[PDB]
Homo-oligomer: 337 residues x 3
């Protein structure tokens, strides 16, 4: 939906320098922007390049203004303003509009105002959908689960039974919330299933990427705090608790009963042991092997990175035989002393 540059600047709390009557149709990268587009500059090295940008307007700082070759929106934080103006001008469609005739909705489900449910979605008994909730095509929402106002599920999302999801969440396709945790007792080598009768509680403003799995708790609950962001294909095991505003990048695997504090950042492909705690304000870099609890804030890392194969072969053999190397060092220390 087009907008006048002056009106866009007002909504962004930005200082307009140029023609307020310019009509902005959408956001584009600096290299792709054309007439009608607004873009942004975060790297002052592109000041000399602005004359090569064909956008109708550019978001920049006060220091950048003398280098402009277009209408400019001056702000303190061009990146944040970019996020805000991309939401104003978002072209992303909704997962559904209205309630599709092919959706199958139990008579006991409770629908709020302005709820949309896509084709062939399945809503179980007792489900409660808040105002403005959107359920994509082909989703399944299990018995008695509740989804808060403004939350949206893309196509082919699976929500099991007794799940609680807060307001203004966003869940991408393929995600499964509330499957059985990996709970079994061993009986003379045979695995005896332990029913998982806990739930999943997801807070407000949670975003979950595609094909992520969040299992329900065994007795008490798996809990996702407010404002948490989770990338694609993470495994959040039963009775994991993730604190508010924590970010979990793609492909992270967590074991059961792990507690992650608030304000943490878990890098992609990390692996985290269970029945332990990570305190607030912890950053684990990508592929971290998290075996022990983390009790102090800060940045933690693991992994021996890539080498040419010929070189790696020796690195690996030497590390595997490092005990012998250690004994040789000690022996030579004694001989010299």
């Amino acid at each position: 939906g087009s907008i006048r540059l002056a009106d866009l600047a007002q909504q962004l709390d930005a200082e307009l320098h140029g023609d307020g009557d310019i009509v902005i149709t959408g956001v584009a990268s600096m290299q792709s922007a054309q007439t009608g587009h607004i873009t942004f500059m975060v790297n002052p090295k592109y000041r000399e390049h602005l004359g090569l940008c064909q956008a109708s307007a550019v978001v920049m700082t006060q220091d950048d203004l003398p280098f402009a070759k277009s209408a400019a929106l001056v702000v303190k934080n061009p990146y944040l303003t970019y996020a805000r103006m991309a939401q104003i001008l978002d072209t992303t469609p909704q997962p559904a509009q209205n309630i599709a005739p092919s959706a199958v909705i139990d008579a006991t489900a409770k629908l709020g105002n302005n709820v949309s449910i896509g084709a062939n979605a399945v809503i179980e008994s007792g489900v409660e959908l808040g105002d403005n909730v959107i359920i994509g095509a082909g989703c399944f929402v299990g018995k008695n689960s509740k989804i808060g106002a403004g939350s949206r599920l893309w196509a082919n999302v699976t929500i099991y039974h007794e799940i609680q999801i807060g307001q203004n969440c966003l869940i991408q396709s393929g995600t499964v919330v509330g499957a059985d945790g990996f709970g079994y007792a061993n009986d003379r080598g045979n695995w005896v299933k332990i029913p998982q009768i806990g739930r999943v509680i997801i807070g407000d403003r949670v975003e979950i990427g595609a094909c992520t799995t969040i299992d329900r708790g065994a007795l008490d609950d798996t809990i996702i705090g407010n404002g948490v962001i989770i990338d694609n294909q993470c495994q959040i095991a039963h009775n994991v608790v993730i604190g508010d505003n924590t970010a979990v990048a793609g492909g992270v695997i967590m074991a059961g009963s792990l507690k992650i504090g608030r304000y943490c950042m878990i890098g992609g492909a990390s692996v985290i042991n269970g029945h332990m705690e990570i305190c607030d304000k912890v950053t684990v870099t990508g592929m971290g092997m998290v075996m022990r609890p983390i009790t102090e804030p800060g940045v933690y890392s693991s992994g021996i990175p890539l080498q040419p194969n010929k070189v790696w072969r020796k690195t690996a053999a030497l590390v595997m035989n490092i005990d012998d190397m250690s004994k040789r060092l000690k022996s030579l220390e004694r001989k010299v002393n």
Copy 2:
């Protein structure tokens, strides 16, 4: 709801308390209220049992003196907990009866008391045994057979010519029987090898969510009886998993791997193919399995987490460990 005396009988536990107590469900020790039964395994909880508000606590004999409520004595409280949770299970069924929106090929063979959920799709030639439950939105491909008592949750995908035994359970998002990753090369161009093998899943198999089990190239991918597989796992074509083996979340297996019985593969492990792991092998989390394993026991790999400042130095020295080795050899020669 069940009387404590009757529950203790079905669990073969010795009752120490009022058997007329009504038990309505299971709860954790910290959450239990009147009417709940709970359990304890770690002796550290003996001391605040007076604070637990459960109507009954499953415990061992040595725990009995510390009991502050009715108690059921057993040898293995965790196994008894498993059993009593099944008796008191509240989990609903994926479906009940056959939904009008389900699309079922007329040549499908359905046993007695088969339930198929809304908008599930059943292909031609499919055979569903007695008491099988198919969740909403599932797909079951041509000529696949699912044994009596087995259950699929919503949005499970079974390809064609798949065989699943009795009393299995498959969680949502899982895909059984996709093409294995098989290709020939014709001057840099990948040439697809059709994957016309199958997947054979035994009895009492439980598979997690968003797990993938590829069909074999010519012969079959085989999952033994009693196997349990967690979420986000990849089981490549022609993998064979022995009975009662457990695979934790996020495990990736390459093609033609053979795993024995009673194994335990820790989460996020990576197991390479065309090799065998013997019975009774445990691989700890993130294990990097490159070589065959021929002796039972516990195996591990990986350098664990350190503070970033410390890790920088560790990784740099490790990557230059060959120079360290050469310097040590030189020093030995000089001395």
Copy 3:
């Protein structure tokens, strides 16, 4: 499906030795093959074993021929011939046939000739499906997405909006193409979602496995080249670019804005970080931890393999304390240097 051996041999450009009138009904492994099956031998150690194989015909080399105990098709490359003959005798069914009445298709969708759409699939407005496209049951294809002629989706595949897929592609079930990239800004300690309005562009002859995810770009596009093959459980982040004919094995994770060249081979469970480039003809072995750009072709590797747990505990402790070992070595060198 069934074919005379002589005709099969002709289509494979193979030299027939034996009865061309034999009727071949399918392909089977050497151990499983029975009458009517054709099989193949790539390992000459099985020459002594051919008398135990009950296939009606065996594909082999000229050097193998004296060891045959059946009709033989002689070729230069038995493995490639096996791929070709398995395609000829393929028993894999199609994901769908015709347009299912339970499918929900927007009136503005444009369908080519001989399109098939499986039961309960959902096709959004503006979608374009090329000739001979097959959409499996339960799929979702989002607004304005385009799927090229001959391309096929198995059941329960999710294609978001504004996605472009080329010709003769194949996508296995549970895969998600075009979900939001992992993009967020920071407003005084609060995550602010960055709309991901780029796309995914997939070329021709691309094969993608099951439960793989390929996110759309933030502004510009995530791009998959022609002839690329991608295994199960892979994660391709926003704005990744993959060059033609590259192969990505199962469970690989690629972070945002990674560019991978042509003819690369990425081993299973590798982790490739973003905002960097990997040149043509690079092989990364399994579980490789890629933190830096790769500018020369060749084979690269990382990882310390498995050991018995008691041994690993000692290895891990010594490695974690390697800075102390380095300092002791340097001290000893000074002593040996008489300083």
